[PDB]
Paper text:
[name]-1 Env is a homotrimer of gp120-gp41 heterodimers that mediates fusion of the host and viral membrane bilayers to allow entry of viral RNA into the host cell cytoplasm. We characterize Ab1303 and [name], heterologously-neutralizing [name]-binding site (CD4bs) antibodies, isolated from sequentially-immunized macaques. Ab1303/[name] binding is observed only when Env trimers are not constrained in the closed, prefusion conformation. Fab-Env cryo-EM structures show that both antibodies recognize the CD4bs on Env trimer with an ‘occluded-open’ conformation between closed, as targeted by bNAbs, and fully-open, as recognized by [name].
As compared with a library screen that would not preserve correct heavy chain-light chain pairing, Ab1303 and [name] were isolated by single cell cloning from SOSIP-binding B cells derived from sequentially-immunized non-human primates (NHPs). [name] sequences were derived from IGHV1-198*02 and IGLV1-64*01 gene segments and contained 7.3% and 10.5% somatic hypermutation changes, respectively. We found that Ab1303 neutralized 12 of the 19 cross-clade strain panel with IC50 values < 100 μg/mL, whereas [name] neutralized five strains in the panel with IC50 values < 100 μg/mL19. To further explore the interactions of Ab1303 and [name] with Env trimer, we solved 1.51 Å and 2.50 Å crystal structures of unbound Ab1303 and [name] Fabs and single-particle cryo-EM structures of BG505 SOSIP.664 complexed with Ab1303 and [name] to resolutions of 4.0 Å and 4.1 Å, respectively. For both antibodies, there were no major structural changes between their free (solved by X-ray crystallography) and bound (solved by cryo-EM) forms: Root mean square deviations, rmsds, for superimposition of free and bound Ab1303 VH and VL (235 Cα atoms) were 0.72 Å, and 0.89 Å for superimposition of free and bound [name] VH and VL (231 Cα atoms), with minimal differences in the complementarity determining region (CDR) loops. Thus, Ab1303 and [name] bound their Env antigen targets using preformed antibody combining sites, rather than undergoing structural rearrangements to accommodate their targets. Similar to the results for b12, Ab1303 and [name] did not bind BG505 that was captured by PGT145, suggesting that the closed Env trimer occludes epitopes for Ab1303 and [name].
Author numbering:
A (entry chain F): 1 to 9, 11 to 27, 27A, 27B, 28 to 95, 95A, 95B, 96 to 210
B (entry chain E): 1 to 52, 52A, 53 to 82, 82A, 82B, 82C, 83 to 100, 100A, ...
The structure:
Amino acid sequence: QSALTQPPSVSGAPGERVTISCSGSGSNFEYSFVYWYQQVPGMAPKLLIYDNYKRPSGVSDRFSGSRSGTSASLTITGLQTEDESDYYCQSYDSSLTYWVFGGGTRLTVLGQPKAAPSVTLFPPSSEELQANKATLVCLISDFYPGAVTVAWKADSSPVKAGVETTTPSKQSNNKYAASSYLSLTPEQWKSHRSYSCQVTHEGSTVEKTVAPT
Amino acid sequence: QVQLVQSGAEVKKPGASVKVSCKASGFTFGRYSFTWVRQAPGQGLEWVGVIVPLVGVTNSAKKFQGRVTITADTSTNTVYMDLSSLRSEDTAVYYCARVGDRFGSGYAMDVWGRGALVTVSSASTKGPSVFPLAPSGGTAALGCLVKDYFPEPVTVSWNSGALTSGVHTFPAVLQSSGLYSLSSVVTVPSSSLGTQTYICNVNHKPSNTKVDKRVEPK
């Protein structure tokens, strides 16, 4: 099979127009049909365009497809916040009976204002310490855009060992959340005088600290 | 309102086999084709295979040679994909998609099933240990740590549903041991801390583990 190259992503403000390109390496890509799919995260893909430019029933007319040389393009007119999704182009090779997907393009709709993360830090509970376990819990929430970086400090020195951090996840209020856990032994926790979960977001770092009580 | 109804989520050990089904709703096989498209977590769609039940032809991507068998049952209009000798790379959501117009023409996937999540992991089923996260015009934050369970999902309630305001259950973390951990925190007026009790109700259905943990001020 051959490969279809898509843009890593695309960004635009509400009402703006955005275009997503698609390049095939196969020799016959110019004349072969191209299809476009939209996948809202958490849902199944849906067909937007088939046969270069045709649009199924119930798909908004601000989606359109076109072909230029050995390339295909999807154009989204009048951007709306729900248009945030991944967009995949696809081609079909008749000589192999293969479907070939593009790498996908993530469309971000600009406009939402920057929000700093709220940090909540919990020490290991006494019940967990009685179970010979210890877990520090750093809960992060209410930040936009959807990216943070987390660092931990034992006293005034970095740790890295035992850090488990999740991917950003979209909250119900369209901001983002994340969690970071530090596994430790009861003696490590009572060895240091405190730990500090440092969350960095847009060049600003938010810090919380807990100590054995 | 035609649909493709798929089977449910399956948890598998590496080396095992999985069989996902896809049944037509509101139509019959006819001249349609049926494809299988999977999506690993955090990656793009990948085409797996295809079946044209009318003529009986089946094909699948080169990387799945010898591991997939696509079959069909015309009397119940059900398509089956069987993927054997599973590995971590096979952890994905497996979709079925109908292809072609009512004359068997066209190659666009126009009707999609909701998908079926397949998890491949050597971890064994385990219920979670629940620990309280004690609180220490201001608000207070108190929570529950749901530690070391497999597989997903777990549900977290507060006061059997009665407390729904200020509740934030965060997505879980996957530890290096294959077990999951998550946390659920509620924000309350700090003066309410001495008015009432707070109980988090943890339910882990894959292990029928139900835990009620009281969360008290230090």
